[PDB]
Design a protein around this ligand. Structure first.
Ligand SMILES: Nc1ncnc2c1ncn2[C@@H]1O[C@H](COP(=O)(O)OP(=O)(O)OC[C@H]2O[C@@H]3OP(=O)(O)O[C@@H]3[C@@H]2O)[C@@H](O)[C@H]1O
Length: 179
DNA sequence: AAAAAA
């Protein structure tokens, strides 16, 4: 549990935020070579192996990582531009976003913005949305989003994880409730 | 900061 989480957090740093600090160059789809990631991870944790990383990918409860052959990427969460190929979510009526209550006045004025990432992240699941908001602060509000309001304004929603969804932005008129 | 830990 403890060693996997540390290696998994470093993987997220490398694959979403700072591949260049380790000498890696993602392609336009966000993939790096698997052996490159293992060698990068080894300069911090020298006991990491290809099989140990493959384990983390297959057991990740959110679907954070994707392996295609000898290539690996994070599926969402990037702060550098990636051309993702996820399928569109056309079925969800409501989506959810958890956030510290202190952010609500700004969000009611501007809607949800991607901030430092490329996309706004939301969830199909209320618990997962609230647990994500709790990363940033103790007092959290659950935002309910009308997904069809989003599609009507042209902001298509993509299936990035099991429950994770990404969208360009969420205008304030599409936030129906804050709980 | 699933954005390492010091
Ligand atoms: N207009 C506005 N004004 C002020 N504030 C705003 C805002 N519009 C939005 N905000 C808030 O700014 C924060 C950005 O934080 P940021 O970490 O970029 O986003 P999120 O909290 O959505 O997390 C994403 C992934 O991170 C985890 O890692 P994971 O476990 O792999 O997956 C999960 C998950 O999918 C956030 O509080 C948001 O409300």
């Amino acid at each position: 549990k403890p060693e996997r989480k540390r290696v998994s957090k470093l993987m997220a740093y490398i694959l979403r935020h700072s591949p260049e600090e380790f000498g890696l160059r993602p392609d336009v789809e966000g993939f790096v070579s698997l052996n490159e990631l293992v060698n990068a991870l080894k300069t911090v944790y020298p006991e990491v192996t290809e099989e140990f990383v493959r384990e983390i990918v297959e057991n990740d409860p959110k679907g954070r990582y994707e392996i295609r052959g000898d290539r690996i990427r994070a599926r969402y969460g990037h702060s550098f531009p990636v051309s993702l190929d996820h399928e569109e979510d056309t079925e969800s009526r409501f989506l959810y976003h958890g956030t510290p209550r202190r952010n609500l006045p700004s969000i009611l004025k501007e809607g949800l913005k991607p901030m430092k990432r490329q996309y706004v992240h939301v969830s199909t699941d209320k618990i997962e949305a609230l647990e994500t908001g709790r990363r940033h602060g103790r007092e959290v509000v659950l935002l309910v989003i009308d997904a069809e309001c989003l599609r009507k304004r042209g902001f298509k929603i993509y299936k990035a994880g099991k429950n994770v969804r990404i969208v360009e932005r969420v205008p304030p008129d599409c936030i129906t409730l804050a709980v």
